[model samples]
Structure formats: C-alpha cells, structure tokens
Target: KEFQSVEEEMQSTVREHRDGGHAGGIFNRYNILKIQKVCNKKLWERYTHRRKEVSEENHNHANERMLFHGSPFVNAIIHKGFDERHAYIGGMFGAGIYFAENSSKSNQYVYGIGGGTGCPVHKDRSCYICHRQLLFCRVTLGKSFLQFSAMKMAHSPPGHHSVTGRPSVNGLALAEYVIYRGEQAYPEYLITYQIMRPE
Candidate 1:
C-alpha cells in the first residue's frame, strides 16, 4: 500500500474542486483558503501576506495583463498546477475564455429554454457577487492564457422564440438587466479568476 502526502492530498482536493460540477457555485477565495491550509501552511500564509499588498486595481490588473494572471498571488484561492498544456474545452465551458457557444453552459432563462432546460436548475450555481439567486453568465478568472468575455447588448428588448412558449417577461427583464449592468461596467465584464492550474 502507498500513502499520499499531505501536499498530494491537497492537490487532489483542489482538482476535485476544478473538475467538480457547478465550479462557479462551489469554489471561491474562501474555499481556496481551506484547500491551501491542508496542503501547505506557508502557502496560506503567503496568500494572506500578499492580500495586504493586493489592491482592487492589482486584482483587476491581473485580469488584463497576462504576466500577472498566473502568479500564485493572483490565483491564490484556487491554486493548483497542471504542467501540461491544457486543451481548450471549446468556447462554451471551462477556463476564462468561454463564450457560451453551447447553450447548456448559460444560466439565462432563454438559453435554458432554448436548450429545453431550466436556467440554473441543474448547476446549483448562485451568483458570486449576490450569492442569493441563480447567476447570469459570469466570467470567473480572466487570465491571459484563458481570457474572459461577456455578452454586450446595445439595448434591451423582448426575445420571441418557440422554445420560450410565450412572451417572456423573465427573458426581457433579464436581458435588460444584463445590458444595464454591462453598460455600467462598460469595457469590463463580470469576471473572477475561476481556475488556477500552474505550469
């Protein structure tokens, strides 16, 4: 029989969080702290030590600059190492660059209805910022290797489609809200570094 070291266990746990379903829901900075403490106390300390140094600008800066994205300081919460080049899981899911090319990945009611699924019903996801309800599409982890993006709407209007089965107030309201929020954030989309696999 072989024994796994604490570091190995921690690594496994981190991967479980990554590979686990509903990643946008289940993991975060808080969960990252929990995983790091189990593997290396020093890593946790380093993260906390750096927390004092990291400003909101630095965090946002990491999103735009490729160099800063991979630093453990940037991805401290969900940190793990994958030495191999990760193949893109397509443009719809995983990593930072997803565009919701696949209908299933979206948390929107219309997208779900289009896919004949209920929005946010299966993913068990809640908005990270609000944390109370099902999330709209979000960009968690905007890194250089896997950059993030959001749908920009010039205006809000009702969408008509057979899948919706009716004129959808939910769809129109959600669309308006997304557009309004996008305009407020302007060039920046709702993003957080959701994945961290080291090289």
Candidate 2:
C-alpha cells in the first residue's frame, strides 16, 4: 500500500497514536502478535471444538462466534486476475481464511469486519489453515482500526504500490478496499474481546 507521501501517512499515524481515543502504534503490532501466540496447534483445536459446542448450545445468540484473521494486513493475499493468479492488488475478490473464536454467549462480544472484495466468512467447520497459528512475531495487545488505518495508509499507492517516498494522494486507494461480500463498516468495527479475556 503505497502512499503519495510517506510523511503524510506517518503524520496521520502519529496523530492517531498520540490520541487516547485511537490506538497507539504499539497496539498494531501487539494485537496481531497475540493472535499468533494463541494460534497454538493444541489450543486452537480445543478452541475450535469448544466453540462449535457453544454455538450449538447457544443456537440463538447474535454475536456468537467470530473468525478473525485478526488483521488482513498479516493474512494471506487474495488473488484476483484473469486467471485468478494475481493478488488483492488485482482488484477482484479477497478471501480471508481464519479461525472462529466461539465467544461466550453468556459473556458476549460485538464485532464487525470490513475491507476486502468480499465479506469474511467464518466457517463453522473449523480453521481451514493448520489448526494453529504461525507465531513468528508475538505482541502483547491487539491493534485498533485507527492504528490499522494508519498502517494501511502507510502502504497506500495506486494499484497497491505504496512506494515508501511517494505522496499521500497515491495512497487514497486504501479506502478502495471494500467488502464485496460483507456489508461496509464504519470508521471502526466494534469487537467484543470475550474469548481472550480470562475474567
């Protein structure tokens, strides 16, 4: 994601970081990392199985389970081209593969997804990946939509170039990533942290 100017993007990011209403830069790296840590093979399996059970039991809960790729930034790149060989840059449909965290019906969580050429599907079957996380970079906290926005803007460029030294206008395309599947989200999607919270 190449921005017309890196400085502008950084400036925006810094502003959000400084404001308590938004997330600090640290949360961006941290939230993603925490997800990776929880992606342990054993734990995810238990989590998956348990989530299914809970989904069945609740049966009518609104915000029941959630399939979080955590953040699209670190997730797989969707391909959309003539032969379906290109990536999200191709401007087709981007599919997000992730695991669902069966939030406590009694506890409850409220979350909505945004971006991408499609709505992220939360397959109740189980994690399509390895049933574990690739815990390469671990962080202590989760990032906010604002933090993600700044990071995304940092990569803004037409057709996904986001050249490091380019200007901000080159990166307006960041808002272009829309939900072709799910509904469009506002500035921030509310997410209930029921699963991760120990209580």
Candidate 3:
C-alpha cells in the first residue's frame, strides 16, 4: 500500500521552510494549518518521466529542488497540474511558470477567496474560515541558465532545461526558477495558511 499519510511530516516541512528566514519580512508571520500531499496518478507519472529524462541529461543530478508557488487557482492546479497558458504573461523571465526558493517571494502572489475570508476547496466549517494557499513543488532544474536582466524568452535558452533568475543587492531581491514546460515540475504539496499581522 502506498503511504499517503505524510501530512504531519509535510506540515513540518512547510513550517520549517516558511519560518527559516524572515519570510514575508518582519511584517507578517505564516500560520500553516494544513498540508496535503498531491495524489494524482497521472500527474505523478508525468513528473517521474520528466525527472528521469532530466536526470539522465544532467549527470544524474536532475538538479531538482523543492520550491514554492503561490496562486489563486490552487484548486485547478491541484486537480489538473500546472499549465503554462494560465501563467502570468510577461513576467521577469518571460511568460513561463515561476517558482521561488524563498517563501516570502512566493507569498506575494498568494490570494484568498474574498479577501482571505473564505476557502474554495473544502466544505468543512473550519476549512471555510479563511486562509491562503501555497504550492510546495518539486522542480527539475536540469542545466538551468542563469539570467540577470529581464528577458521575454518563450523558453529556456538553447541547451538549458530551465531559467534561473539571480538575486542581487540592488536589483532582483530573490531567486526565482522558471520552467517553460509544465512537466518539469510537480505540485507536491498544498499548504493552507493565514498571514498573521504583527501586533
């Protein structure tokens, strides 16, 4: 039997990472309530396929990393996986799906139903109480091309499997990973949380 009861461990991962740094700066704290592992067979099959391809090409490294992605369409992603067509067009690294290593960076895109006052996926009364969602994803960064300035690239530069936006002191503030192919990433965990404003 497959182990699908790692919610507790998953919750710890979210808490540790979200609180590892000054996530969302000193203005807010992330209060994680639930962590659910994605269990879509089709999605997992595709993800594993891509991972193997990347692994073979990258000297077995695959360069996979656990990252965060905040989106309002969490339910859609959970059900159908990531789709580039739904991505925000013309972002820093062009119109591709973006992931962040820093939770604070991803937090910028998190939105709740009705101003963080309702839940869209669960019907339980407590679940409807209000929270935002963040996706904890596994991204295959096989031979990523490092980029500094913004570029409208429709795909990673030739020979690269992904694009990495570098962080700078006076420029880009956080590292961002961009993958043009949706199959290059897997939406592994869905984290539900509320932002606690400082007193």
Candidate 4:
C-alpha cells in the first residue's frame, strides 16, 4: 500500500487535512515551506497577497490568498484533516470539490456525486452557507485522482440559511464541528493544498 510507512501516511494524511485530509501537521512552523507550497498549488500564490478587501486602494488579491494565513499557529487538537475519500457516506451522500465549472458551492458537496442516470442531486441542496437550496449537478471521480484546491472561502458572510448546516468533516455533519474547531488554527489551509496533514 502507498501508506505503509508512517511518514508516507503522515504525508498523505496531512495533505488531506490542509486540503486533502489528515491532521498531522497543524502547527509545525518547520513545515511552513511545505504548507506554503501546498497552499500555492491548492489555492494560489501565497506571496503576492495584500490582505485587504473592496477598496480602490485594495492591493490584496482576493483570488490569490490563503485565508488561514493569519491564524496564530496550527496545532493537532487545534486542527484535523477532512480528507474527501475518508468523509462520511450516509444516505448515499459525501462531498469534495464540486466538479461543475463555476461550481458555486463546495468541493465536499461534489464528492457524493453518483452519476448514474441524470444528475447526482435528486433533491435540493440546502447549502449551510447560501441558505437557498439548488438542484445539484455532478461528475464522477471513478477512483482516478486526488484534486486538491486550496481556497479562502469566499462567501457572502453568514449565509441565507438561518439554520446553517452544522460543520461537517468530510461528510458527517455532526462531527464536522469538532474538525472545524480543531482546524481553527490552520484556517488558511482550508481550500488549498494538493494534499495535507493536520498538526
């Protein structure tokens, strides 16, 4: 197996958490370079970010910055990886990056796609963020590859759903809060990294 060695498993695990799923290197500054590399590969260039928003003077590049970059430090208990493949699979639902271009939602939501007949979404997806649910479209991974994309959750502040869906690690909504809380430190690594490991 590719995960026979501890280091290999750690590498794979960390990749998942930062963006793939594994809470191995949450706050180890020694791996800053590695994190930065994953961030760049998953999200965008981490160096050219300005850290600002909506101003003519706004030098920050919203599309190219790691949101969790400002966190104090990333620790294991402070974080955990939510690897797509290892996520919950209840009621035939799982998630990862949505494949639809301008996916308009989340990667995790996309992982559950069972593209057999029509679309994977049989009903409306009441997003925990946007509130307003929509008919979901999907594509299949078919056991191909791991596509990690680091992103700084660009959202419309507290979504429309007054009842936001609970934080979900991979897929289990109830337990996601724990993962979310643990992962508070490495927030910038949220939507990026080809692979990851929690600290």
C-alpha RMSD by candidate, in order: 17.2, 19.3, 6.0, 18.0
Instruction: Identify the runs in model 4 with alpha carbons over 4 angstroms from their true place.
Output: 1-43, 46-50, 54-111, 114-155, 158-172, 175-199
lDDT for each residue of candidate 4 in 29-81, tens digit (9 for 90 to 100): 11211221123222222112211222113232222211111111122212332
lDDT digits (tens) for residues 1-199 of candidate 1: 1122322322232222222434233332211221111243444344333333322424533121100111112122233311112313231122121123121123222222222322244533333333111111222222112112332322222220001111133322111111111111111111222222222
TM-score of 2: 0.19
Scored by CA lDDT, what does every candidate get?
A: 0.23, 0.22, 0.71, 0.21
Task: After the best TM-score superposition of candidate 2, give how far the Cα of residue 74 lies from its true spot, in angstroms.
Answer: 16
TM-score of model 4 (CA atoms): 0.18
TM-score per candidate, in order?
0.19, 0.19, 0.77, 0.18
In terms of lDDT, the poorest run of 10 residues in model 2 is 102-111
Clashing pairs in model 3, backbone N/Cα/C closer than 3 A? none
**Quick one: best TM-score, which candidate?**
3
lDDT of 3 by residue, 59-92 (tens): 8878999888877787998888888776555688
66-184: candidate 2 lDDT, tens digit per residue: 22223333332111101112124422223312221211110111111321222235431111221212111111111112112223232223322111111144332222122211111
Segments of candidate 1 deviating more than 4 angstroms: 1-39, 56-94, 97-199
Model 2 regions more than 4 Å off = 1-39, 60-199
